[PDB]
Amino acid sequence: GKHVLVVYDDLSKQAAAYRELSLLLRRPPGREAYPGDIFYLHSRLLERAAKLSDAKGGGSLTALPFVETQAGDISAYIPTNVISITDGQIFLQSDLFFSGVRPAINAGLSVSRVGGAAQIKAMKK
């Protein structure tokens, strides 16, 4: 019945470690030499966060996975896999960071599907 917040700091590093293990086991590689089950891995990890019904106790668990991009390439394999799973994304840009705009959330690209329901009435107003 408690509420838990979980922060994953480098899913990219987790994926790199899993790729290393898979290549050492001589499993066939996919794109960017990643194994075929990396999306299965990440979806299995992320889907364990849920909001429980009143019959199950009413507890909840929220996850904030982290993904690092090389030169802002959000079309890479792991970034696309993580983006397609989560309910929303927050984008941070060094262009905004250096221009004095910090925290550097890019409101144009950021999305939150649960928005509105996750706000108080005055904040919605």
């Binding site: 030169a71 802002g72 390439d73 959000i74």
Partner: protein
């Protein structure tokens, strides 16, 4: 460089190009209309010049 930054750079340059082309198109019509006003000005100035060129002395 990064392809994302390159595409954003190209898109911004294209938008600026469109704006500047629209500006030039507008300025062309403005010049075309101003030339007629200059031509309409000419006769009155010519008459005043031929009128005041002698009585000034």
């Amino acid at each position: 460089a990064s392809l994302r930054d390159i595409k954003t750079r190209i898109n911004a340059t294209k938008k600026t190009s469109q704006i500047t082309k629209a500006m030039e198109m507008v300025s062309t019509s403005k010049l075309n209309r101003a030339e007629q006003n200059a031509k309409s000005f000419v006769p009155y100035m010519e008459k005043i010049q031929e009128v005041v060129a002698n009585v000034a002395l």
